[PDB]
Amino acid sequence: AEFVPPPECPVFEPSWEEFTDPLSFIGRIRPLAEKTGICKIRPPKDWQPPFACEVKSFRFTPRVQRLNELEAMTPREAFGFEQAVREYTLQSFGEMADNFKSDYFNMPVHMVPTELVEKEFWRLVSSIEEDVIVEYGADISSKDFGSGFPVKDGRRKILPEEEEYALSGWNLNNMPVLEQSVLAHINKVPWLYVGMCFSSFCWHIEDHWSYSINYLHWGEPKTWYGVPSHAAEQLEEVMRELAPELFESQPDLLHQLVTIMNPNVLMEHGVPVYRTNQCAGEFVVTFPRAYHSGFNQGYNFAEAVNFCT
């Protein structure tokens, strides 16, 4: 009855030698990681970049997420006016996020097991008797208040011990993003995600089937689910079979806005699914055409960008 956690995706702990170049390292781990879709990379213990966002000015309006919006399809009065998008700071969002989680579980936020938040998230997604609503500071451009990584653009001070991280290849601002094409001869920045408990992103692949790299700067873990690219057509078949008929014929770019599905449903149809808990300071790499989704365990701050090889 309860949620069955998928098997864990690979976790790599590269030495300082292997950590020298990200593209070479990802190319070496590819024979295994491309068979799981996603993988986690723990940097060496002494690799600790600072947080370089403009915190004093960081203001955002997170989007409202109703967990059971799809199960509710199968009309309430004044639908569409459930909750307005409101402005937070990092501090005020974190206070709201911690208060929500501690009130919901009746525990301190860091004492709640990750398996319990996971089991409760999927129960709420399919629940018609309990309407839980959360907020997600998602798709915040790094050009607004700066990247979480230090950058040498002359906008914010960089200490001498921090210059290493502004020049590091693992700095998401230093990832290659320019795809090769003839049009490029004839003629992208990271995004930020401020999460709270139960805030989520649904199943999707990247534009142009691109790689993606994701870094959790700080906070509570981000829970991931990934499908290897060799099962991409299997997942899309399961989606079309079980998606509402109103959304079944929608283009993939639009359907990916509401592609929420319990991983056990995919596993029961033969789709291989892997999971991981991405903790603060760890990278998650998604491979080409690897479907992925997930949710946040609590107040956290992530940075993501598509990169090309």
From the annotation, which residues make up the binding site?
136, 204, 206, 212, 214, 222, 292
Rounded to 5°, angle at Cα 98 from 275 and 192: 60
Residue 202 interacting with ligand DKP (CB under 6 A): yes
Contact region for Mn ion (CB under 5 A) — 66-74, 189-197, 207-215, 276-284?
Answer: 207-215
**Pairwise CA distance, residues 197 & 133, whole Å:** 10
Residue 256 interacting with ligand DKP (CB under 6 A): yes
Binding site per annotation, positions for Fe cation: 204, 206, 292
Q: Which does 256 bind (CB under 5 to 8 A by kind): ligand DKP, Mn ion, none?
A: ligand DKP
Compute how many other C-beta atoms are within 10 angstroms of the C-beta atom of residue 298.
Answer: 24
Q: Which does 302 bind (CB under 5 to 8 A by kind): ligand DKP, Mn ion, none?
A: ligand DKP
Number of residues near ligand DKP (by CB under 6 A)? 13
Compute how many other C-beta atoms are within 10 angstroms of the C-beta atom of residue 193.
Answer: 22
Local structure of 295: helix, strand or coil? strand
* Cβ(289)–Cβ(235) below 8 Å: no
Contact region for ligand DKP (CB under 6 A) — 8-16, 181-189, 198-206, 243-251?
Answer: 198-206
Binding site per annotation, positions for 2-oxoglutarate: 136, 212, 214, 222
* Residue 240 backbone phi and psi in degrees, to 5: -60, -35
Compute how many other C-beta atoms are within 10 angstroms of the C-beta atom of residue 103.
Answer: 9
Distant-in-sequence, close-in-space partners of 63: CB < 8 Å, separation ≥ 6: 85, 135, 136, 138
Number of residues near Mn ion (by CB under 5 A)? 1
Closest CA relative to residue 166, chosen from 51, 56, 302, 43: 51
Residue 33 interacting with ligand DKP (CB under 6 A): no
DSSP string, 59-126: EE-PEEEETTTTGGG---TTTT-S-----EEHHHHHHHHHHHHHHHHTS-GGGS-HHHHHHHHHHHHT
Residues 223-242 touching ligand DKP, rule: CB under 6 A, are none
Nearest distance from residue 148's CB to Mn ion, in Å? Answer: 17
Closest CA relative to residue 48, chosen from 224, 282, 261: 282
Residue 304 interacting with ligand DKP (CB under 6 A): yes
Print the binding letters for residues 119-138 with ligand DKP: x by CB under 6 A, - otherwise. Answer: -----------------x-x
Of 149 and 193, CB closest to Mn ion: 193
**Which residue from 193, 211, 225, 299 is in contact with ligand DKP, where contact means CB under 6 A?**
193
Local structure of 215: helix, strand or coil? strand
Q: Which does 208 bind (CB under 5 to 8 A by kind): Mn ion, ligand DKP, none?
A: none
Residue 243 interacting with ligand DKP (CB under 6 A): no
**Which residue from 36, 68, 142, 214 is in contact with ligand DKP, where contact means CB under 6 A?**
214
Print the binding letters for residues 61-90 with ligand DKP: x by CB under 6 A, - otherwise. Answer: --x---------------------------
Residue 275 interacting with ligand DKP (CB under 6 A): no
Closest CA relative to residue 91, chosen from 306, 307, 301: 301
Site residues for Mn ion per CB under 5 A: 212
Site residues for ligand DKP per CB under 6 A: 63, 136, 138-139, 193, 201-202, 204, 214, 222, 256, 302, 304
